[PDB]
Amino acid sequence: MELCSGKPFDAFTDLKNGSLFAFRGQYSYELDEKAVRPGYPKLIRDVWGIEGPIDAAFTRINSQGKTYLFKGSQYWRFEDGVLDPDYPRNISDGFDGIPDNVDAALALPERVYFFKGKQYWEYQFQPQFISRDWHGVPGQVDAAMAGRISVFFFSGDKYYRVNLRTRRVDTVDPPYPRSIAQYWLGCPA
Ligand SMILES: [Cl-]
Ligand code: NA
Ligand code: NA
């Protein structure tokens, strides 16, 4: 499927060195401005060596910058696209207190956040309600990712931008929630 199909996404990694990956179904899309074919649809099994769909993803901010993919009760950790030895592992073993089958995850510009249903967990290398602490985020999310100064939450075919200083959905025009394809990816009309 094409990146700009307008369909919802399943997971996003965090912006790292100007690039990130989006996931939808069996497909992995590398989002890099330097790409000659930006967002060329590749198979998750071909790029990451695992079957889609995936549940959530994040990338850590440290210099190793390892990427974590979550599916069901398991997670995989990669470095430079290569699966580390002794993965996959159980979420319950790597992330004590985090549930299986998460909806989304993100790593802050060291804190990671997991989202499932109306709740989210803070993990540092006690659930709370998403709408209580992320002002303007409706509750249930389908995917999330962090940039440098903002985080983004995805719901169906639309998304929200949250300012990290205020923890509030920013006021833009047209307002959030708005089309992922049109306003986040800049897809052609
Ligand atoms: Cl995600
Ligand atoms: Na994510
Ligand atoms: Na998801």
Side-chain angles (χ1 to χ4, degrees):
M1 169 171 295
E2 64 269 28
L3 177 69
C4 294
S5 72
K7 299 299 186 171
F9 288 90
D10 295 331
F12 286 96
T13 68
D14 297 300
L15 189 67
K16 174 183 176 287
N17 300 331
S19 73
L20 66 95
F21 291 88
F23 296 90
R24 184 193 292 127
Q26 294 296 341
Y27 285 94
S28 168
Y29 308 88
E30 192 173 15
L31 308 187
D32 189 333
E33 205 85 270
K34 306 167 291 199
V36 289
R37 307 174 182 179
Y40 186 86
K42 301 180 174 173
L43 293 173
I44 296 166
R45 74 178 60 88
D46 286 346
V47 178
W48 303 95
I50 68 183
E51 292 296 309
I54 64 167
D55 289 338
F58 67 79
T59 299
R60 289 174 68 178
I61 63 183
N62 61 29
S63 39
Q64 282 194 305
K66 302 202 174 205
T67 291
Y68 293 68
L69 308 185
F70 295 81
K71 183 173 165 48
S73 63
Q74 292 178 304
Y75 73 103
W76 293 253
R77 196 182 71 179
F78 303 78
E79 181 171 358
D80 298 312
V82 177
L83 184 63
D84 278 339
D86 304 317
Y87 288 83
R89 291 184 71 250
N90 284 2
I91 295 166
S92 61
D93 293 332
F95 299 92
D96 196 334
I98 302 309
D100 296 342
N101 296 309
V102 297
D103 293 333
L106 68 87
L108 284 184
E110 194 176 14
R111 299 174 180 87
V112 173
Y113 294 95
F114 290 98
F115 305 82
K116 185 181 178 178
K118 305 179 201 184
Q119 297 180 111
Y120 77 103
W121 290 253
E122 176 173 346
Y123 181 88
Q124 297 182 7
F125 289 98
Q126 288 57 13
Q128 308 291 4
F129 288 86
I130 293 171
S131 294
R132 179 196 187 274
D133 295 332
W134 304 87
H135 288 149
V137 183
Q140 293 160 22
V141 299
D142 294 323
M145 56 82 58
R148 287 271 183 85
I149 61 174
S150 308
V151 298
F152 299 82
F153 289 103
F154 301 83
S155 175
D157 64 340
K158 299 181 186 68
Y159 77 103
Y160 302 85
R161 185 179 83 203
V162 169
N163 183 256
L164 275 173
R165 193 183 63 81
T166 69
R167 288 297 183 90
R168 186 193 327 281
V169 169
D170 282 329
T171 54
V172 298
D173 199 340
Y176 303 116
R178 58 191 191 182
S179 167
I180 296 165
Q182 175 171 2
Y183 292 102
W184 194 77
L185 297 172
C187 286

